[PDB]
A and B are shown apart, each in its own frame.
Chain A
């Protein structure tokens, strides 16, 4: 179901997700892979996916996504828990550009994302400011920019939030 949701989310863009994990015991292994080939420009709704993954689980967890330069393409790997092997992005809200050389990786955990968010003074209200990854694949390099994105019409967002609240 998570793969279906993710493809539905990425239907806007051209990124390709690779094709049944369970909530009470969430997997430490990779749960999804997203691929973007050379010359492509596409955005990845990072924070949205993280928050979605954390919603999916019914136990405390720290969702993490890794971005790698395969050397032919860009790869996104999804985790419910940040691996010991997993790298982190040395970025701030103001300066958020990361250049990946071949076989090199970066990463973002939801917790440290929250730390960056608070440090930046970024609005924490839901769906008011979501960190996304602007991804330009340009071999031998992968260009990343972790930019906070806001809604086109906030009013519409609140209405939607209100409805959602009524459901519960």
Chain B
């Protein structure tokens, strides 16, 4: 062979490993240190490219996909996180009593179109609410939401998820829960006018909404009639809708 071949360098170790099982086990198990713990990505970034233990980072330092196990922020958020998808469904159906906890979610539609038909159109796609709930429960409390119609799809609804701060971190647990819950949708990271936003839009075959029990629309409206919104949140939503009006996400 022209060049000492593979295993030529690796030959003694492998003979020794054939001789010594325990040392082989120790060696193979010892390879637990990842050489690359974070890697830069570019927007628009599809979050579907991230595996279960990947976390996401967005800031003036750039955008990075990182290993959650080697993440200090993830480590910090780690103790309070435990998943209840059936519970997600339960929260969606029984949201009527618990509207209070999800006020901003409704405020958005209430800001754009107070009509019953609009709220109905929003309730047509539960996975959006699944997204908002997972994000909120994941420590991303001050997230704001926007609703637009899908131009590249027929009768489909798009949801923008706008973050408040100039630095955003999505935990790997939260990310995994998010991708798991919104199986019917695709989520892409973007930046628009210095604002980090997650774009959630419906994808492919089948309508997921058929596989979740219907919910009362007029009753939620009736309940909403009593509710007192912040009023500053609603105007905030007005300017947010105004700002993202010319925002045009790319083709699927």
Contacts and interface: CB of A to CB of B under 8 A. Distances in A.
Interface of A: 5, 8-9, 11-12, 41, 45, 48, 51-52, 54-55, 60, 93-95, 97, 99, 110, 114, 122, 126-127, 129-130, 132, 134, 136, 138, 143-145, 147-153, 156-157, 160-161, 163-165, 167-168
A23 to B, nearest CB: 12
- Give the residue among A41, A48, A55, A149 with the most B Cβ atoms within 10 A: A55
Interface stretch (B4-12, B142-150, B162-170): B4-12
Interface string B31-42: 111111001000
Contacts of A145: 51
Contacts, number: 111
A167 B15 contact: yes
A51 to B, nearest CB: 5
Nearest to A63: B6
Nearest to B35: A148
Nearest to A138: B52
Dominant SS among interface residues on chain A: mixed
A60 B8 CA distance: 12
Given A138-B52, A144-B51, A127 B33 contact: no
A116 to B, nearest CB: 13
Contacts of B91: none
Interface stretch (B20-28, B71-79, B112-120, B238-246): B20-28
A8 B18 CA distance: 11
A152 B154 CA distance: 54
B49 interface: yes
Given A97-B50, A152-B31, 13 more contacts: A5-B18, A9-B28, A51-B7, A55-B14, A60-B1, A93-B36, A129-B35, A136-B51, A149-B33, A149-B34, A160-B16, A164-B12, A164-B13
Q: Report the contact-size class of chain B (Cβ under 8 Å from the partner).
A: 35 or more
Contact of A152 (B9, B30, B35, B39): B30
A149 B15 contact: no
Nearest to A132: B31
B6 A110 contact: yes
B61 interface: no
B16 A126 contact: no
Contacts of B33: 149-152
Contacts of B50: 97
B225 interface: no
A93 B35 CA distance: 10
Nearest to A114: B6
Contact of B49 (A52, A97, A147, A160): A97
Contacts of B34: 147-150
Contact of B30 (A54, A144, A153): A153
Contacts of B62: none
B233 to A, nearest CB: 36
Contact of B13 (A11, A127, A129): A127
